[PDB]
Design a protein around this ligand. Structure first.
Ligand SMILES: O=P(O)(O)O[C@H]1[C@H](OP(=O)(O)O)[C@@H](OP(=O)(O)O)[C@H](OP(=O)(O)O)[C@@H](OP(=O)(O)O)[C@H]1OP(=O)(O)O
Ligand SMILES: [Mg+2]
Ligand SMILES: [Mg+2]
Ligand SMILES: [Mg+2]
Ligand SMILES: [Mg+2]
Ligand SMILES: [Zn+2]
Ligand SMILES: [Zn+2]
Ligand SMILES: [Zn+2]
Lengths: 193, 193, 292, 261, 50, 70
RNA sequence: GUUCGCGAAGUAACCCUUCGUGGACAUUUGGUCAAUUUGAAACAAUACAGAGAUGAUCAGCAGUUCCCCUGCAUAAGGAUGAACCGUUUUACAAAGAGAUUUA
């Protein structure tokens, strides 16, 4: 709905939450359709959410054993860095991705004592707690971010954009203040006219 | 609200669009109430917008911590018995659906079928008789008026044979250290130093 | 000021007859119709069981500058539209008063933020300055195409036959119709004469009037109504050759009739606007030949 | 009464027979927010309305007659109303009793309840302005409505006279052969507002005509709001009726001061 | 007429303040009274030094 | 309805239909408007008007041809 | 519909059924919003041009504006984002000479 309100009908949002263009875009269309972090970080959360919901669907359809469901959820939570791409738009998630990797070493070498190397470990409870605490701290982030996006859709952006000073333009703002001080002091020395 | 093409849906499209800031909270409530491996299915209490915009899982998953430890410990045993004697473990393919096919409806597809058996350890009767009737429930001992306060499910209280039985199931995942002299220079005060 | 705002200006006849009205305030509701700038939308219902929500369409600044209510946008005193208000004050002060409105979105917003009154809003909202002009309204009440070949058409118009009882026809030919006198006023005068009121349900009579040719015709169904239309008309004029013509009698006007004795149809009067003007110019002599 | 109050309103179009909510495809992809097509070149995007109002047939008592509805059904005028006798809005031609109920309400919004605007739309179409009590319609697009039949000049006007007479009291009808357009003036604004939505995108084909099977292929006729009449023969009529309106109001207004004193 | 003024229960998902947009307005100046620019009269002789 | 790939086109016989010819005809009038505007310029160069003048004679001859077919 | 009374009929023997009649219980939803053309998104395509400080080639950073666009943004980018590159007469006097007037 949000893509189509912005006029971006040449971008197709897949059912697995993959966002790909439907044609070769003009440069004006690439400028317009360049979505930000809060769209994609929201879109990658739904990619993560659907990927977990789909395994319970596959379990419920009969296609997947209950051990494969436990192993499937364990595979998702430990491989979000290669199944989603959430790191591209919020790179603080590499703490959570490396926590689920470091938890997997603890779980596997206690699970696989006197067992061979193989897939079927589904003790997904430690890695589940990581993402539930990742979701704990990004609720206030994305409510501020997407709330700024939707109100900028409904209302437009403000016309009172005052630019703060920066390293980029400190030499530019210095001369504007320097020219005004010289122009004041001469205009006060002037007698008239 | 599948094909919102009429003029009547113009107000409901703003409701879909203004709910996107609340969507990360709906993913936290859905993933925390995810079914544990010893459950076929789980009824959750939900709160939904009347225009079908957002669906929050309006529950918090509260457990008895000795019961919850023994449930994950029995699945720890049940999954190491599985990986020991399975000839070949087929991990499923991810993503479990193609991105062109839509998420198939619950009622035409999922609801009509028998679910499947979950991960349940067989619970030998002479050694586990105090827990085997209620261990793999959704909320264990929820309607038992003497073990819990009620269906609000707070403030449990057990007897000695039930408490030692959960202790015996939990031995894959318990602490297994009883002296505090083990943690001599390995406590958090030494970690701060 | 967003925390100090005026109460809304609504008429008494928008609020209606009941005493207590539950009104809903939305602090930035819709935007104004006039200045296109947001305001506090008040909306309400006359009774509890009503079925029409009465919204405030304009902001209180646009309602104050015109001195109108926000709901029906009629004047707060005299309860008349703005276009008629500024016309009535124009006949008293003998100069044109007019509230003019910008077509420009930057000049709709500009014109609302000024604290002036517009048009007749200086005269109204001052009760002393409004009552004396009503007194000045009272003294006013104490006063209280020669090249055209038209010959193909005038053979088909009757123009030589008489309005007697004895022909039994459906159609008639109405001439001497002014450029005023609207098509509904001639059907209402005939239906008042026959008592066949609400004629548009049964389709008893069908009337075509050109208003350029100053001529027309009215067709009846069920020819027995034609003798009722003949007999219910008393006054007639006899041309000094003969050939009596009945007069329909719209207020202060006179419309002559002759039985067509066939169905005239559309386009009998003319097939071009330049052509129809000459038929009125053709007739004007025959009316003067009929009377004088 | 005999034509309207005797019967009840009937369902014009079955709800399965109603048109599809998506428009005809003039683009590559459909847009879900703005229910239109996006990657497209252009389009005329005007089509002949499949439905039409038979005024003496479809009129009847509705649910809004018993509820005291002020407002007319929009899709009754288009000949598209699927609700029939269960519909909340009125299903009949405006009469002097009906417009007298609307007399407080007509100043700001039309007979269909839709709110009017400060100034007119650029092409003189749409709902209308509240600053002008306009009672005259611009009947245009007659070439498309006829399906291009030559039809003479007098005959086109006669068709306009037959159809618009069913929709209320008519003040005058003028047809201009050179401009190929007509101007229909009604006694009340509520009949002009009803007949604008009734005869928008319609035809004049009169089924005894050869084309009647190809009435759908055409463009359709434009009924939009009319401008002021430029000739001084009718300009002087306008200040005369404005003079008579003013004297009828001053008599009403001195009685208000008589009660006020 | 005594008129109770109430607030409508806003939908938490629909945008509150529907007439609120980010638009730009030019403002007219309310100049009712002229402010006298109360200078003194006139040490006004000056050569071409400036 | 598109027809951009199709020539003006100088040949007339190939398209039997007149209603299609209704579209082809505007396809020509539009150029008549563009170039016609391109006829009066501040420079008023002979070479530009001179080529435009030839285009006008070519178009007028085409109007004679369409009239002759009718 | 339920419940508390009251009266009558039948079965009864003061209980049940039946229908007459008082109470009590419960008491004002919803819409700023109607379903394809006529009250308003926008791209794309076609045609015509075609990137500031220049002698040529390359980085930019600002400012003014009743232009904004992307973006979470007070970051940054939008060609240094664009527009800017035109049109320009009275706060006017003081001195010194020849032609044409006036009465
Ligand atoms: O190739 P190895 O060095 O032997 O390690 C593999 C590898 O994990 P690491 O490479 O990070 O150690 C597998 O993970 P993938 O990278 O292939 O996805 C993992 O199993 P998963 O594929 O399910 O993660 C497997 O663990 P195991 O075979 O015990 O199930 C583990 O082997 P190790 O047991 O030697 O760590
Ligand atoms: Mg550059
Ligand atoms: Mg750049
Ligand atoms: Mg710039
Ligand atoms: Mg910049
Ligand atoms: Zn306003
Ligand atoms: Zn009012
Ligand atoms: Zn209806």
């Amino acid at each position: 709905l949000l893509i189509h309100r912005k006029g971006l009908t040449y971008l197709h949002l897949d059912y697995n939450f993959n966002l790909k263009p439907t044609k070769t875009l003009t440069t004006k269309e690439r400028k317009k359709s360049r979505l930000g972090n809060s769209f994609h970080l929201m879109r990658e959360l739904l990619k993560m959410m659907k990927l977990i919901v789909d395994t319970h669907v596959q379990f419920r359809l009969g296609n997947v054993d209950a051990f494969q469901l436990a192993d499937g959820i364990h595979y998702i939570l430990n491989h979000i860095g290669q199944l989603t791409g959430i790191y591209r738009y919020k790179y603080k998630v590499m703490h959570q991705i490396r926590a689920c990797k470091d938890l997997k070493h603890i779980i596997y070498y206690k699970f696989n004592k006197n067992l061979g190397k193989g897939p079927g470990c589904g003790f997904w409870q430690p890695a589940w707690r990581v993402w539930l605490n990742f979701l704990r701290g990004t609720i206030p982030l994305l409510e501020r971010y997407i709330g700024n996006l939707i109100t900028r859709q409904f209302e437009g952006r403000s016309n009172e954009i005052v630019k703060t000073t920066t390293k980029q333009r400190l030499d530019a703002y210095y001369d504007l203040e320097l020219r005004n001080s010289v122009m004041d002091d001469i205009l006060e020395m002037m007698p008239e006219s | 609200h599948s094909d919102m093409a009429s003029k009547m849906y113009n107000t409901d499209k703003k409701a879909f669009l203004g709910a996107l800031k609340y969507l990360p909270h709906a993913i936290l409530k859905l993933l925390e109430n995810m079914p544990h491996p010893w459950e076929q299915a789980k009824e959750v209490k939900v709160l939904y917008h009347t225009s079908g915009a957002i669906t929050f899982v309006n529950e918090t998953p509260r457990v008895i911590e000795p019961v919850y430890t023994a449930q994950w410990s029995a699945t720890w045993i049940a999954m190491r018995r599985e990986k020991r004697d399975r000839t070949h473990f087929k991990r499923m393919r991810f993503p479990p659906f193609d991105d062109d096919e839509p998420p198939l409806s619950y009622e035409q597809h999922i609801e009509n079928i028998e679910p499947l058996d979950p991960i349940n350890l067989p619970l030998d009767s002479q050694d586990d008789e105090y827990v085997k009737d209620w261990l793999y429930d959704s909320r264990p001992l929820e309607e038992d008026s003497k073990k819990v306060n009620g269906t609000s499910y707070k403030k449990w209280s057990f007897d000695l044979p039930e408490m030692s039985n959960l202790y015996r199931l939990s031995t894959p995942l318990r602490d297994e250290v009883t002296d505090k002299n083990y943690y001599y220079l390995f406590d958090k005060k030494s970690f701060f130093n | 000021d967003e925390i100090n705002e005026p109460p809304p200006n609504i008429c008494e006849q928008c609020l209606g007859d009941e005493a207590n009205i539950r009104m809903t305030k939305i602090p930035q509701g819709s935007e104004c119709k006039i200045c296109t700038l947001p305001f506090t939308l008040y909306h309400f219902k006359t009774s509890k069981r009503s079925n029409n929500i009465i919204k405030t369409l304009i902001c209180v600044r646009c309602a104050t500058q015109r001195n109108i209510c926000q709901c029906c946008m009629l004047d707060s005193r005299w309860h008349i539209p703005i276009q008629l208000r500024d016309h009535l004050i124009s006949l008293v002060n003998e100069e044109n008063v007019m509230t003019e409105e910008a077509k420009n979105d930057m000049m709709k917003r500009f014109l609302s933020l000024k604290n002036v009154k517009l048009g007749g809003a200086q005269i109204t909202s001052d009760p002393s300055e409004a009552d004396n002009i009503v007194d000045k309204l009272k003294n006013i009440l104490l006063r209280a195409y020669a090249s055209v070949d038209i010959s193909h058409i005038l053979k088909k118009l009757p123009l030589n036959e008489s309005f007697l009882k004895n022909p039994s026809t459906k159609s008639f030919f109405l001439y001497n119709i002014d450029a005023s006198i609207p098509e509904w006023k001639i059907t209402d005068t005939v239906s008042q004469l026959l008592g066949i009121k609400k004629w548009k349900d049964g389709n008893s009579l069908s009337l075509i009037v050109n208003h350029k040719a100053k001529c027309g015709g009215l067709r009846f169904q069920s020819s027995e109504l034609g003798e009722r239309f003949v007999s219910k008309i008393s006054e007639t004029l006899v041309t000094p050759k003969g050939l009596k013509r009945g007069v329909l009698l719209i207020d202060r006007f006179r419309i002559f009739i002759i039985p067509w004795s066939s169905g005239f149809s559309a386009a009998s009067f003319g097939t071009n606007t330049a052509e129809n003007i000459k038929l009125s110019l053709s007739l004007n002599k025959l009316i003067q030949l009929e009377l004088g | 009464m005999t034509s309207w109050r005797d019967k009840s309103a009937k369902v014009q179009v079955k709800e399965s027979e109603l048109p599809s909510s998506i428009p005809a495809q003039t683009g590559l992809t459909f847009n879900i927010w703005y229910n239109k097509w996006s990657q497209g070149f252009a389009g005329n995007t005007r089509f002949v309305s499949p439905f039409a109002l038979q005024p003496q047939l479809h009129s009847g008592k509705t649910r809004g007659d018993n509820d005291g509805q002020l407002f007319f059904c929009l899709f009754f005028a288009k000949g598209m109303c699927c609700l029939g006798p269960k519909c909340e809005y009125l299903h009949h031609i405006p009469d002097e009793e009906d417009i007298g109920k609307l007399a407080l309400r007509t100043e700001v919004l039309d007979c269909f309840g839709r709110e009017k605007f400060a100034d007119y739309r650029e092409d003189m179409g749409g709902i209308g302005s509240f600053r002008k009590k306009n009672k005259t319609l611009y009947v245009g697009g007659i070439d498309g409505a006829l399906n291009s039949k030559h039809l003479k000049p007098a005959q086109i006007e006669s068709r306009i006279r037959f159809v618009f007479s069913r929709l209320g009291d008519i003040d005058r009808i003028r047809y201009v052969e050179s401009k190929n357009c007509g101007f229909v003036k009604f006694k009340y604004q509520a009949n002009a507002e009803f007949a604008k939505e009734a005869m928008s995108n319609q035809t004049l084909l009169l089924p005894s005509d050869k084309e009647w099977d190809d009435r759908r292929e055409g463009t359709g006729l434009l009924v939009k709001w009319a401008n002021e009449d430029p000739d001084p023969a009718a300009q002087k009529r306008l200040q005369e009726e404005l003079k008579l309106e003013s004297l009828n109001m001053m008599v009403h207004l001195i009685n208000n001061n008589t009660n006020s004193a | 007429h005594h008129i109770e003024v109430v607030s409508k229960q806003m939908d938490p998902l629909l945008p509150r303040f529907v007439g609120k947009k980010a638009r730009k307005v030019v403002a007219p100046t309310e100049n009712d009274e002229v402010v006298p620019v109360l200078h003194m009269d006139g040490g006004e002789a000056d050569p071409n030094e400036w | 309805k598109d027809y951009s790939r199709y020539q003006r086109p100088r040949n007339v016989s190939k398209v039997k239909s007149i209603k299609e010819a209704n579209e082809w005809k505007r396809q020509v009038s539009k150029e008549i408007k563009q170039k016609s505007t391109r006829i009066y310029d501040p420079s008023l160069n002979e070479m530009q008007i001179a080529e435009l003048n030839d285009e006008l004679n070519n178009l007028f001859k085409e109007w004679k041809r369409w009239q002759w077919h009718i």
